[PDB]
Amino acid sequence: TGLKSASDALKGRVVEVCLADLQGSEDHSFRKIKLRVDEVQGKNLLTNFHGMDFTTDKLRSMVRKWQTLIEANVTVKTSDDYVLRIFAIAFTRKQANQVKRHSYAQSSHIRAIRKVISEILTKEVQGSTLAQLTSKLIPEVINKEIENATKDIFPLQNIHVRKVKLLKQPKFDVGALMALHGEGSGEEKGKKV
Amino acid sequence: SNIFKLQIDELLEQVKLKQKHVLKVEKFLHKLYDILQEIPDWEEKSLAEVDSFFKNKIVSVPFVDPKPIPQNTNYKFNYKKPDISLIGSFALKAGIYQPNGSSIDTLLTMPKELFEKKDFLNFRCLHKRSVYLAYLTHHLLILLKKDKLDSFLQLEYSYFDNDPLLPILRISCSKDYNFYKTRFSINLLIGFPYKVFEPKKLLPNRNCIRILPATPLYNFSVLSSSTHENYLKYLYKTKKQTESFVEATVLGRLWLQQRGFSSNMSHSGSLGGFGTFEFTILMAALLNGGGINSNKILLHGFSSYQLFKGVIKYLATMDLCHDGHLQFHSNPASKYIDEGFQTPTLFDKSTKVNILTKMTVSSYQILKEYAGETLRMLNNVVQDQFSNIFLTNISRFDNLKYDLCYDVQLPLGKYNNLETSLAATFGSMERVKFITLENFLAHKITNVARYALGDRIKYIQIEMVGQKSDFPITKRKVYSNTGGNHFNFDFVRVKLIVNPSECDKLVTKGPAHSETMSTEAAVFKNFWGIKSSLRRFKDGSITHCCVWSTSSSEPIISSIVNFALQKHVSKKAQISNETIKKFHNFLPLPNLPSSAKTSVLNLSSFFNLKKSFDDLYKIIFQMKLPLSVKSILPVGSAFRYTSLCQPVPFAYSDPDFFQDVILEFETSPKWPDEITSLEKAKTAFLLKIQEELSANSSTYRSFFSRDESIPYNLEIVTLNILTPEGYGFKFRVLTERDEILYLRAIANARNELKPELEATFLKFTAKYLASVRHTRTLENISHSYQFYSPVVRLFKRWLDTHLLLGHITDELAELIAIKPFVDPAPYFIPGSLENGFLKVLKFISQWNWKDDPLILDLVKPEERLTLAQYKGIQMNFTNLRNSDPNGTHLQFFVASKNDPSGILYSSGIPLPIATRLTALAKVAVNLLQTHGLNQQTINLLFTPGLKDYDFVVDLRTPIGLKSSCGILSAPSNFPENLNDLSEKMDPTYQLVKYLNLKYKNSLILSSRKYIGVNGGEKGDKNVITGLIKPLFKGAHKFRVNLDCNVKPVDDENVILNKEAIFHEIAAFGNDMVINFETD
Amino acid sequence: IEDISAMKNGFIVVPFKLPDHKALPASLHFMFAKRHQSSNSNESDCLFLVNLPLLSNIEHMKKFVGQLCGKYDTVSHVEELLYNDEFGLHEVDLSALTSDLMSSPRNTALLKFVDAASINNCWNALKKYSNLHAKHPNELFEWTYTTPSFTTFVNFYKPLDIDYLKEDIHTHMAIFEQREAQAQEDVQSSIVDEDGFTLVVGKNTKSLNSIRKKILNKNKKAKKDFYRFQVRERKKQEINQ
């Protein structure tokens, strides 16, 4: 109706979908994501990436006693002017042939691991846009970068990113959104009198 | 904030010549006012004798229509003599030494009783002004005959401030007592009493004129031609208070002149209506006010730059036309009421005249964005742009100020054909509202343009080209039967600066459909008629709208202007613009289904390329290698929306066909420590990728090329995936063991091989590393700068037509072309392909290398280079220009946040090629200002070369390659083996590459790589031009380090073996070559 | 002008024709020649060939001396071409410059012979050919262009053959990993200097060239108090100011 049209009653809604439902597989059965409605055209809501989050059962299924969890977070501004608070969790593994039951890190190994986590994931951002970062963290490969960069210090099973928050977003740029989706323009029907 | 004061001081030293050309014109002014002191007077007289007075003299009388008749002009004249004093720029010592020739003022007021107190009727106050000027004209001719100066001076009727209702008498010093040198004209304008009126009939809504419409032009003209001296009174008062005023006058009128807003007039199809004394009296109002709490925005004590900043900031933020204005009085405050007048408005309470009604609404509207842009570019501490603010001239070209320029030919004939040629109304109320047909038709055509475009444009300007504000004594006015008129133009130039997000929107909606139509729906369907329609949309919404058809050649704004002209102003008028048509069909038409009816801002071929890459990227991430693929990501020109041939499926002979993509894996520590085994391990990974792709995705086709672009590593094999959708991709592998390995080759290289290997490492950085963030920032910038991609395709077509592209890199072309977008100042952002391309060429003509870099920030308007970053790239430019000052081997220093080193994209270009680029741009800008924007001008601008280039080796093909290159005037398949791709492609590019690579010290070659963008209708005409080096001007003796091709005739001297070298050029391309020429 | 047949400091003009071109209405190319000798492997009894033809491969230098032998009955051990850097692709050797293993002027070429009799024979024989062109240009023995520029070089768009570069990658990576494991074993044994000294070697340093290059790239505490003379000097410094 006039006085609150529907296309601006929308445009603020975020939806929380499952990455398994968005990607067809089931190894993304955790890791829900948020899509923010930006532009309405022709009974379609075109969305953009708004965040990422684990389910609580995943990290409760990861936490075990007799190890340490090193968790880090950095507030990074991308190659757009999106600024993101992006998190990271990692758990200290025990090696194969380790007979002591503990496998704790000595907290300087925690500070050094958290240092290289912050450095290399703030190198993975700033060197990405939002679309490039999203396509980077779909196939879990920043976790492989953390694992390869950190096996010099501690073994570190199941590193994950676990949470990505938007903080500020630059402007709209309908052209950039429609280049993320695909084109479209309508000349429609005409009244027949 | 340091060098601005030195800029003000050097500017005043450049503009001041105030001792030499001032006292001699003061003495000739002494002679002039003594002559009009000794003029004889004239008694009380009448019209039935004044017609016989000026019956067959040498001097005519000017007038406004109708020629006044004695029935309703029972009128009388009294010739009393008024006082004389000086007014204006000379009176305030604000004289500027423009080579055009500035003006200078005389005071001719009137006594208080000689003319009756009924100045509110039908222009006979200005008719007694005209007969006053008529007898002063004839007897001033008499007095100059008796003072013998009939030789060199010329007195001429003109229009005071381009007003057809206000003539004046100007002396020009035409060809001790001869004079032909300084600013020429001296004008003879009048005044009135300070009280000619009743004070309730001065605000411009009033009326008493013949058949209640307002006459704002009329009661502004009588108020201006009364008061030319109270402005001097309180202006001199404010000049006695503040001492920054005269500097503010000269630099503000310099600003207004160098962006072309001169106070000539506006209403009659003139850009302008704003200038020096309006600027300075509003400056004085800003001194004595500016706030609703009587906030004195300015103080009369500080410097001139702070005062100019305050005035520009105020008239940038504060809107004066559409909602509200600030009133100021003289004999002071400035109060903001929120009542707009639909007129650029600032009001008085002393003279009681709206001053800026000589300014029109659209010219104020565009001056407001000019002042806002000036505020934006003087309120940033990073750069140094006083040349952009004051020193450059932006109005000297007809095209760099306005994105679109249409020629309205109006062959309507005469006044008695006006009724049934002009499709508007013409009669009483329009003629009393707008005095002449000039400003009547101009106001109507800018209203029709504003309604026909709406949000499809930003601002509008109307120019009556060919308008002459001077006329001889042989006519009472300006008689002009020019191009089919009887008024003061020949044709019309309608000029547009657009909103590039909404030009080619093919539906321009009105309001929605109610049960009974609103006033907007009424005027919309009246305005459109046959085009108007009622449409329901995909979201279920009924709007009034109209549908246009995008062509590649025509922007639909052209069809909108053409329709709204042949419906609402005339019917037999013509609208021409072939500049945009020539520039739009210079871009190649892709062989796509229904691609003559596409737009020019349509990137859908690029989007289909990106979707085919998305499918390939999916299967590569889902295949399983010994290392997980970290990032596979595209870096090609058609991924940053740059390629000439926008990608058509199944097109081998496009040199931008195979798009570069870079993949990298996890950081394995088992990468080999040596460069050749490293490249062989990378291609072992590529061999694994290729065999798994040919195992499962059999619809993809794949072979292996061999990269040769990075020198001295000869193992860089890249595979090429041919998608089923019809596209091709060169895959590279980047490791983290590449840059450290190259850098240690720099480290332990031999000591005279280090710059050579540094060039190798620069090629590696430009290809692998820096290109990724390059294509990322250009793809993120090209959606906020809408016209960047078509002006780059046009600019690289220009480079390939003039055959430079084999030396100047495409990323250098892209950075050169992005400069007038990310830094459009002092101009606006390019809203047309024409404006963008000509602004690129204007910049590269204007860009002097050896003191100025090309450092630029790739950011959207409204990530940055800070002050430290800007000083760092400034300082390393100075480092390079003191290690080499004259540009021996680094010719361009273009740099950004993604590359602060400059040398990266501009290494390896020869000084002949760089000087040919700057010279060809200088040639183009001087020829464009010489001839003008014409079709033959644009055609000769795109004629290839024909200059001091020496060889023309002309080569052809077995088959022209535009069918298999996708430029239509049909390949849809790949052959059964992937080596017929070779004979479908063309060899001229790497042929001339190998030839220049061998002969690089003796002569430098050039060709065109896109063979039939420029090589005719078939795709065959490709030339090879050679230029001999600066060493080879004599005949040297044989030493060891010559690197030439020898033919000595005597024993000492050796000369070039020219016959054998182009014979073996012909042998290297002996199927391709057909012809040789030497200039 | 034709009769010039010998330059200033030991050089020889050997000119030859160019075949039929469709757009050239006596197209002649030159070869500078100079004999020289040294004592090393392949710089002794060599001919400096300057301004050699554009990609003059092995086979038409081979037929050049072959029809020299079939025309004037010379001796020629010509099956080799050296220093033939035509387009400028092998100025440096980046393999040897980046790593030690698998390792250890402009427009010139090296034509080696084996016999001093052969170098004197072919030197005076091409001097005779220089002189006989210098007196008459008519029936010189010439360029038989059974075109090698169109097959022995035209690879620029032909794709590389799969099994070929497969086998190339296979044998190259085999021999490289072989001598790389050798270079790791050599440094990770107990390097003992021949007096008694034992070389310090890292855990995973994998070569000894790396050790010496790390050497080449890598080529106090306090007190202003507490001493009798130091506090005496600072007390006199307070006296100074």
From Swiss-Prot, chain A:
GO terms for biological process: cytoplasmic translation; maturation of SSU-rRNA from tricistronic rRNA transcript (SSU-rRNA, 5.8S rRNA, LSU-rRNA). N-terminally acetylated by acetyltransferase NatA. GO terms for molecular function: structural constituent of ribosome. GO terms for cellular component: 90S preribosome; cytosol; cytosolic small ribosomal subunit. Keywords: Acetylation, Cytoplasm, Isopeptide bond, Phosphoprotein, Ribonucleoprotein, Ribosomal protein, Ubl conjugation. It comes from the Eukaryota. It is found in: Cytoplasm. Belongs to the eukaryotic ribosomal protein eS1 family. Present with 92400 molecules/cell in log phase SD medium. Component of the ribosome, a large ribonucleoprotein complex responsible for the synthesis of proteins in the cell. The small ribosomal subunit (SSU) binds messenger RNAs (mRNAs) and translates the encoded message by selecting cognate aminoacyl-transfer RNA (tRNA) molecules. The large subunit (LSU) contains the ribosomal catalytic site termed the peptidyl transferase center (PTC), which catalyzes the formation of peptide bonds, thereby polymerizing the amino acids delivered by tRNAs into a polypeptide chain. Component of the small ribosomal subunit (SSU). Mature yeast ribosomes consist of a small (40S) and a large (60S) subunit. The 40S small subunit contains 1 molecule of ribosomal RNA (18S rRNA) and 33 different proteins (encoded by 57 genes). The large 60S subunit contains 3 rRNA molecules (25S, 5.8S and 5S rRNA) and 46 different proteins (encoded by 81 genes). eS1 interacts directly with uS11 and eS26, which form part of the mRNA exit tunnel. This is Small ribosomal subunit protein eS1A. It comes from Saccharomyces cerevisiae (strain ATCC 204508 / S288c) (Baker's yeast).
UniProtKB/Swiss-Prot annotation, chain B:
Keywords: Nucleus, Phosphoprotein, Ribonucleoprotein, Ribosome biogenesis, RNA-binding, rRNA processing. Involved in nucleolar processing of pre-18S ribosomal RNA and ribosome assembly. GO terms for biological process: maturation of SSU-rRNA; nucleolar large rRNA transcription by RNA polymerase I; regulation of ribosomal protein gene transcription by RNA polymerase II; ribosomal small subunit assembly; rRNA processing; tRNA export from nucleus. GO terms for cellular component: 90S preribosome; CURI complex; nucleolus; nucleoplasm; nucleus; small-subunit processome; UTP-C complex. Belongs to the NRAP family. It comes from the Eukaryota. Interacts with snoRNA U3. Interacts with MPP10. Component of the ribosomal small subunit (SSU) processome composed of at least 40 protein subunits and snoRNA U3. Interacts with UBP10. This is U3 small nucleolar RNA-associated protein 22. The gene is UTP22. The keyword DNA-binding does not apply. Its main location: nucleus.
From Swiss-Prot, chain C:
It comes from the Eukaryota. GO terms for cellular component: CURI complex; nucleolus; nucleoplasm; nucleus; small-subunit processome; UTP-C complex. Keywords: Nucleus, Ribosome biogenesis, rRNA processing. The keyword rRNA processing applies. One of its GO terms (molecular function) is rRNA binding. The keyword NAD does not apply. Pfam families: RRM_Rrp7, RRP7. One of its GO terms (biological process) is maturation of SSU-rRNA. It is found in: Nucleus, Nucleolus. Component of the 90S pre-ribosomal particle. PANTHER family: RIBOSOMAL RNA PROCESSING PROTEIN 7-RELATED, RIBOSOMAL RNA-PROCESSING PROTEIN 7 HOMOLOG A-RELATED. Present with 2610 molecules/cell in log phase SD medium. Plays an important role in the synthesis of 18S rRNA but is not required for the 5.8S and 25S pathway. Is necessary for the cleavage at site A2. Is required for efficient association of RPS27 with the pre-ribosomal particle. Belongs to the RRP7 family. This is Ribosomal RNA-processing protein 7. It comes from Saccharomyces cerevisiae (strain ATCC 204508 / S288c).
